Design a protein around this ligand. Structure first.
Ligand SMILES: *[C@@H]1O[C@H](CO)[C@@H](O)[C@H](O)[C@H]1NC(C)=O
Ligand SMILES: *[C@@H]1O[C@H](CO)[C@@H](O)[C@H](O)[C@H]1NC(C)=O
Lengths: 49, 49
């Protein structure tokens, strides 16, 4: 639950921008919470992570 | 040509390990928590040294 790609399309909103710097509620592909995003240059994500 | 075939097989079971993840995200060390007494100390302090 709350992670994956088998989503329920009952309640619908549109995809928004990842807005960095401000405290926001996020629903990122099932993950939910509150926080502040910061864009970074990462090299540790493989094709499955 | 002095070549050999090789296939090594050992059984699996459910058990607890301590895995070390390095700077890039690669598992570099592991310890089986119930194999010796040093591994008891290592899994207890959650340290490899
Ligand atoms: C604080 O407010 C300033 C200006 O109103 C804004 O630029 C900044 O992103 C805000 N920071 C946070 C953490 O809300
Ligand atoms: C294979 O091993 C034998 C062992 O005596 C050696 O004499 C021979 O030169 C080796 N041949 C090759 C192709 O490695």
């Amino acid at each position: 639950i709350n992670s994956g790609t088998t989503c329920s399309n009952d309640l619908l909103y549109s995809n928004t921008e990842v807005s960095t710097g401000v405290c926001v509620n996020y629903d990122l592909y099932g993950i939910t919470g509150q926080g502040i995003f910061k864009e970074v240059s990462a090299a540790y994500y493989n094709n499955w992570q | 040509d002095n070549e050999t075939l090789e296939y090594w097989v050992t059984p699996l079971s459910r058990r607890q390990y301590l895995l070390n993840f390095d700077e890039h995200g690669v598992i570099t060390n592991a310890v089986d928590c119930s194999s010796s007494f040093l591994s008891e100390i290592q899994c207890k302090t959650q340290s490899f040294a």
